[PDB]
Amino acid sequence: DPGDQICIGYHANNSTEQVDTIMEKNVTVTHAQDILEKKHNGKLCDLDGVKPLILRDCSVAGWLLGNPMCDEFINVPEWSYIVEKANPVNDLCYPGDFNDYEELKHLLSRINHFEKIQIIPKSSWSSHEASLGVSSACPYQGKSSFFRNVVWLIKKNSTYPTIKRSYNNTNQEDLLVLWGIHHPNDAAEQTKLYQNPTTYISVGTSTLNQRLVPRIATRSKVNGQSGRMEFFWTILKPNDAINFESNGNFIAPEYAYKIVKKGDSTIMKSELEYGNCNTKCQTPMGAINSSMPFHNIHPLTIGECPKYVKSNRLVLATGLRNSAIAGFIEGGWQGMVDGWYGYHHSNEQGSGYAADKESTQKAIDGVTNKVNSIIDKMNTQFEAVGREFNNLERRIENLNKKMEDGFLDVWTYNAELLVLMENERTLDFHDSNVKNLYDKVRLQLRDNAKELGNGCFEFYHKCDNECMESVRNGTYDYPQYSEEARLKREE
Amino acid sequence: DPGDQICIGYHANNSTEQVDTIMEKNVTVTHAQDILEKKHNGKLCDLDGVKPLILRDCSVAGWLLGNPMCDEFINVPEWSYIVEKANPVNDLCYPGDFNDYEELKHLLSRINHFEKIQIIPKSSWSSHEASLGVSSACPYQGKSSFFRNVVWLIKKNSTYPTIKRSYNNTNQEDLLVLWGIHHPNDAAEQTKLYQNPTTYISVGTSTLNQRLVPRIATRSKVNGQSGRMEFFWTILKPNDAINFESNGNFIAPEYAYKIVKKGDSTIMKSELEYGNCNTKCQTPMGAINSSMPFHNIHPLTIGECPKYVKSNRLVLATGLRNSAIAGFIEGGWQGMVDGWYGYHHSNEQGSGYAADKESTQKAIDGVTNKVNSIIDKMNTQFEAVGREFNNLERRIENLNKKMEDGFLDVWTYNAELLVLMENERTLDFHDSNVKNLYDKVRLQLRDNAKELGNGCFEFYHKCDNECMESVRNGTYDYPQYSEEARLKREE
Amino acid sequence: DPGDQICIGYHANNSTEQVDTIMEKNVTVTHAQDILEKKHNGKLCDLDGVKPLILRDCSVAGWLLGNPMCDEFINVPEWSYIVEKANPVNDLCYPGDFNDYEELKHLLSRINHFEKIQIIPKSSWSSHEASLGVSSACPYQGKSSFFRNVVWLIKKNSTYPTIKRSYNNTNQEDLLVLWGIHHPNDAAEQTKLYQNPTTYISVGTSTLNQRLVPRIATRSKVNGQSGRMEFFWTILKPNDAINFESNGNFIAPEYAYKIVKKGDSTIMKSELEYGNCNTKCQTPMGAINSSMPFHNIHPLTIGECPKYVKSNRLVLATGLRNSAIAGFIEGGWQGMVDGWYGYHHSNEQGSGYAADKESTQKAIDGVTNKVNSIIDKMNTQFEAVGREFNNLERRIENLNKKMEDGFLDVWTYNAELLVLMENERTLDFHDSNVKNLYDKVRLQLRDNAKELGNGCFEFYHKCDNECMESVRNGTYDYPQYSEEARLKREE
Numbered sequence A, B, C: 001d002p003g004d005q006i007c008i009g010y011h012a013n014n015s016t017e018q019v020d021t022i023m024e025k026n027v028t029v030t031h032a033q034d035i036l037e038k039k040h041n042g043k044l045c046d047l048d049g050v051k052p053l054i055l056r057d058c059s060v061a062g063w064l065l066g067n068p069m070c071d072e073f074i075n076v077p078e079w080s081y082i083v084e085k086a087n088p089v090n091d092l093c094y095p096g097d098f099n100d101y102e103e104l105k106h107l108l109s110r111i112n113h114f115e116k117i118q119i120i121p122k123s124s125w126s127s128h129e130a131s132l133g134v135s136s137a138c139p140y141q142g143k144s145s146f147f148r149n150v151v152w153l154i155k156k157n158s159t160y161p162t163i164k165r166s167y168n169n170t171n172q173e174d175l176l177v178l179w180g181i182h183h184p185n186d187a188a189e190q191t192k193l194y195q196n197p198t199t200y201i202s203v204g205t206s207t208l209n210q211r212l213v214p215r216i217a218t219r220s221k222v223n224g225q226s227g228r229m230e231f232f233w234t235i236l237k238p239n240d241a242i243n244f245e246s247n248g249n250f251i252a253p254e255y256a257y258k259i260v261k262k263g264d265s266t267i268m269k270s271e272l273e274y275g276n277c278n279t280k281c282q283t284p285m286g287a288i289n290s291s292m293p294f295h296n297i298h299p300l301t302i303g304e305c306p307k308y309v310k311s312n313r314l315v316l317a318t319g320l321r322n323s324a325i326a327g328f329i330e331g332g333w334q335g336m337v338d339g340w341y342g343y344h345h346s347n348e349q350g351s352g353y354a355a356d357k358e359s360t361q362k363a364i365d366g367v368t369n370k371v372n373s374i375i376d377k378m379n380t381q382f383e384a385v386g387r388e389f390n391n392l393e394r395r396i397e398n399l400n401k402k403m404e405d406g407f408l409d410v411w412t413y414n415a416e417l418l419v420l421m422e423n424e425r426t427l428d429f430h431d432s433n434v435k436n437l438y439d440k441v442r443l444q445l446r447d448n449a450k451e452l453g454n455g456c457f458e459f460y461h462k463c464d465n466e467c468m469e470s471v472r473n474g475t476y477d478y479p480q481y482s483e484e485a486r487l488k489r490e491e
């Protein structure tokens, strides 16, 4: 009247943080953690402390050849990836074509060193016209102009002598060389420009064995030209020579480019400001500090990235299902201000709540380890995802799309079920921990106390604060009170 | 002599439905659900309410150029995918080659609008022979003939004047234009047919800059021709002009094709009847109503499909392990005609079975949610899987095969283990639910009853139907009978 | 004073074998099993009982054409894959190019039958010079030489008559035919060698329609040649003829190759000895007997292989957490010399340990089934992983790398978490089994014994070895001792 009591119970709090499990939707819970990165900084950033190459209104081709309307950032000796607009305004001012363009974009996507040099001075053309090679398709300061890196040679007097030019690459570094051929409209234009009616450009390195011949066709005007310029490139290894021979129609190099290539990346289509941030993962919509193993921002990423996932929320339960003084069977304790599982006693020294420190540590550690494993086991490689295929490579683009879409489906399904399965396992761990604590006590006390049915025991003897601590420590000397218990029990 | 009794037990039934778990093979179970679609309708069907294009004995090339033996469905203004036989009977009647054929098949795989028009009337050839261009390789009504969409121009009198033809595309829609070059056997045939010994075809759009030249070689007869016809195509954007100029050997357009292209699909190899069904997933062996997240019919699918899996059966447990009156420890109850877990009482008002409605709902809901999650979380995108690569693209075909085979291995393993893991979890949930119900009762009754060891309690007091309901409701007033219990207990 | 006793306990042993679980790192455990193959034999081996093709210092091209410095294993009628060194010493002695080389390597990667034959005897050149076609780029026995499979025809007297040669393929098997064109330095060399200033090679099968024309350019010396040899191949189906016609610059066939092609494989880069072993999985670093479902040796494998994984250890728990006479609550029993779970009794016939045979079998079977499922459910297809793309196919190489790196990330993550999740499930199974055994006994004995709190019961009656066996059998007749128990209990 009335006997000393110890109850087993668990933490509860004012949290409304919800969670899904394989078996129940929308379960309220004590603490939760999202494993899905949703947040970008909305800017293009260095990658591993190397600037991008931003081409505001130029294309790579425009940029390389010197489209004279390309008002771009000129000096920039190294980059990690390239940013083009979707359809750049300024491409090939004079209509034509860039042979193996997509392969050259991919090669220029990440460069360790890039330095333009002069290989063939515009001044060394003694027996041809350097400065007439000019068009109203390629306007500069209101006047007609041309690509600035490459010389459109015309006949001088009424003569176009055969050209012979070797350049030997005496630099330490691979040289990227560009040249072109002019495809004129008719045999009139051919002779008007080059005198010789039948022409060729021949180019040879140790690798290259090229003989180009102009093609006449009747073609629709583009930038008011029916002519076409067709451009070619090669990489001149650092002790080789390139050898040009031409009768006519030659768009000769002035400027080449020293390159040092140390692994690839890609070209990103984006409308964003550089931001002076560093990052290890860049997106068309912005960069990411990628601690989380999943993101849902954009598929077309460059760097060490979280796996892209079609998903709004990946939330793991970390805490508990959230809902004398009665114990566990009836609900959680707001009063358990600290600890996850534990006790409420009441004796002659008075009542209160105590944490089971030992079984609360085991569980915080377990849940923490569960969360870190799901995060830390994620293998994170460098990748560069772009669209590097032209309108005659659609079969290969469709191969790429099945692969991307394939991996998106695997990660999205697996992450979704991983969260649902481990949430069901986390809430059952908490149940299993509370019930093991009931049984820890039940098995110490045996007949020295009676199970009240609600999570509590009423003692058959006096249990002061020091006896209570021995129950919580698992050091309860049952023989020391079996005598006193037996007397109150029999009655 | 003898006391009132309540037992805890679970449903059992005549089911032989088996299931595998990570730990036990072939476990009999109360109800099961297959998550593996195995059933097709054996027919080719519309896709998203758009007909396929069935080419019974033609190839796409045959079909486009007008191989005159191609007896096909002529009118058909739009399609979602194409069906060819494996090796069609009718291809190129006159032997030769179709430039960039596989890219053109992929472009024509799904078309929003397709309308043949005449761009160059067969009648407009005033200074050349339209109607002699004919061969016994391309037989029609027993007589020698040719491709019907394209004109094989021969010299008139003994003259082949230079051809100049612009067509301007004044339609609203992109035009697909086809032309050809004849590669003859020798300089005799060349002049016999075209007079001029040295010829060219030149074709120019705003895009295209082509000059074809016939090639002589000594070639093996095919359909009794040693000649070769080589065909070319382009897409004429809706305000551009195409410009032909030819000396000879020109296979000119008569008919072109208006196309509107809204995303791609592929070409399916199949021997099946159209069936007037609609579907969202088509297979070479038949269509699928794809509610299930996995199928095992065929890899080469077009649509939103279940993931293809190498597997006979993916069966999830939904029910229970299947095997006074004794309770749970001894087996299941055929008498539990309704509900999964519950009770059998016997008192002075008589005996019977009662469901634990509350804990049976929780579990049906849980299992239902488990099954729906495993199904609903499956991300389902449109994909079109074909073999779009020729016998010089084998490296790219092998890239495609590693990717397909790679995803088949991931899904097949993951689905197999997902079923085994969640089956072990489902059967342990049912164990855990029954035992929690034993403990619900055990904890209400305490010493007012004795555990019989077999799943049952014998009461130490009179428990009529209304007391029993309070045990099942969890509203058992123990103080109301501790007195009467204590008297029968002490004795 | 003192009463008969039965305790429930579990196996323990001197094991230090550790294991990780989703929730605890470094858990000591009774027995463990690695599922990660780490061990290769360090040798190149037959694949499915078919030898590889080892090219010690040759390239495939060198090998095919007969680079006379290629001292290789000559006779070898069939192979399963090819081994080249990274950069072979001996390639094209005379500098040039092999058209569609990578596609030909992939076609020759696995051959069912390969037999060189003579199609055009070196002796049949009556009106040209067979034996002058020779260079100091292609040295043999100190003297100048050439490719041995192919004849460099020079003019005889000062004449190079037009060549006409059909070969008809009267063998049962596809023929691989090789020829070349010489691209000379200038019109002097052209006429010095071939007399005719303007030349062509024309080649025609039922498939092929080729006209090659030599290209002059000024080119850097390679092996002291500025000339270039460019080689071409085709497959002559078994009743077709190939037809050569040449004016000059013709590198004619002597030897062709009978091939029978039955599915593909790839070219492996490795520095290893053949070893006369058979295997079903080959690695650049050595072969594997692939019973395990995961390996971490090398990505570039050929055969039925374990999935490649970035991982040091995949270790599954199979045994138990490893740590009167007290039962389970206090730790494991070294004395439980045999069985996983069971009993220690002590009565008047004396004390000892007994296995619960029934519940130990269930569990060994369960764990064995868990391990076999994780291994046996692994779908294992043939694949051949190589690097089959040249320095202008980098976009397709980058597609391949994302796919490989993609699958490495999926398998590595999934295997890691599968081990951690199933380890946590295995240790909780063992807990759940021991506690069910405590409850098996507790529920048989009821009040005929008292729970000592530590895993033990003290009996309220005499329990000889035969009573004890009935407790372990689950056949304990409680009515047979309730009388004797009640007397000792009341007191």
Ligand SMILES: *[C@@H]1O[C@H](CO)[C@@H](O)[C@H](O)[C@H]1NC(C)=O
Binding pocket: A025, A026
């Ligand atoms: C879960 O919660 C949200 C409210 O935040 C609600 O839209 C949804 O309907 C709830 N229930 C289920 C079963 O999804």
Ligand SMILES: *[C@@H]1O[C@H](CO)[C@@H](O)[C@H](O)[C@H]1NC(C)=O
Binding pocket: A157, A158
């Ligand atoms: C071109 O150069 C000069 C005149 O400025 C003259 O000597 C030369 O012969 C001219 N050639 C012709 C063919 O008109």
Ligand SMILES: *[C@@H]1O[C@H](CO)[C@@H](O)[C@H](O)[C@H]1NC(C)=O
Binding pocket: A220, A221, B168, B169, B239, B240, B241
């Ligand atoms: C085609 O016709 C239209 C309208 O008559 C004209 O504006 C257009 O420029 C023509 N296209 C070409 C390139 O001639």
Ligand SMILES: *[C@@H]1O[C@H](CO)[C@@H](O)[C@H](O)[C@H]1NC(C)=O
Binding pocket: A466, A467, A469, A470, A473, A475
């Ligand atoms: C547990 O509690 C008792 C009572 O306060 C105390 O004497 C003892 O130090 C504790 N035992 C252990 C092992 O912590």
Ligand SMILES: *[C@@H]1O[C@H](CO)[C@@H](O)[C@H](O)[C@H]1NC(C)=O
Binding pocket: B025, B026
């Ligand atoms: C499972 O059941 C089938 C009979 O339907 C049988 O073939 C098989 O051998 C059984 N047992 C095992 C271990 O697979």
Ligand SMILES: *[C@@H]1O[C@H](CO)[C@@H](O)[C@H](O)[C@H]1NC(C)=O
Binding pocket: B157, B158
């Ligand atoms: C071809 O056309 C007519 C005869 O039908 C004649 O006027 C013309 O000159 C003929 N040409 C030749 C070169 O025979």
Ligand SMILES: *[C@@H]1O[C@H](CO)[C@@H](O)[C@H](O)[C@H]1NC(C)=O
Binding pocket: B220, B221, C168, C169, C239, C240, C241
């Ligand atoms: C090759 O020889 C066979 C048998 O003599 C002959 O039937 C076949 O047509 C020949 N092939 C060609 C295309 O000449």
Ligand SMILES: *[C@@H]1O[C@H](CO)[C@@H](O)[C@H](O)[C@H]1NC(C)=O
Binding pocket: B466, B467, B469, B470, B473, B475
């Ligand atoms: C449970 O059972 C008792 C006895 O029939 C009944 O009076 C009461 O309405 C029920 N209580 C609840 C909360 O359903």
Ligand SMILES: *[C@@H]1O[C@H](CO)[C@@H](O)[C@H](O)[C@H]1NC(C)=O
Binding pocket: C025, C026
């Ligand atoms: C696990 O064990 C190894 C010693 O073999 C040690 O390096 C490591 O630090 C241990 N602990 C953890 C938390 O990884």
Ligand SMILES: *[C@@H]1O[C@H](CO)[C@@H](O)[C@H](O)[C@H]1NC(C)=O
Binding pocket: C157, C158
């Ligand atoms: C080459 O062959 C013989 C001399 O050996 C001679 O009959 C023939 O005319 C020679 N030709 C020329 C053009 O010198």
Ligand SMILES: *[C@@H]1O[C@H](CO)[C@@H](O)[C@H](O)[C@H]1NC(C)=O
Binding pocket: A168, A169, A239, A240, A241, C220, C221
């Ligand atoms: C380029 O110049 C270097 C050094 O003067 C020389 O050794 C080298 O051979 C030259 N290259 C060629 C192919 O001429």
Ligand SMILES: *[C@@H]1O[C@H](CO)[C@@H](O)[C@H](O)[C@H]1NC(C)=O
Binding pocket: C466, C467, C469, C470, C473, C475
């Ligand atoms: C179990 O043990 C008892 C006592 O030894 C023995 O009589 C009986 O044969 C056993 N019962 C069964 C079903 O094995």
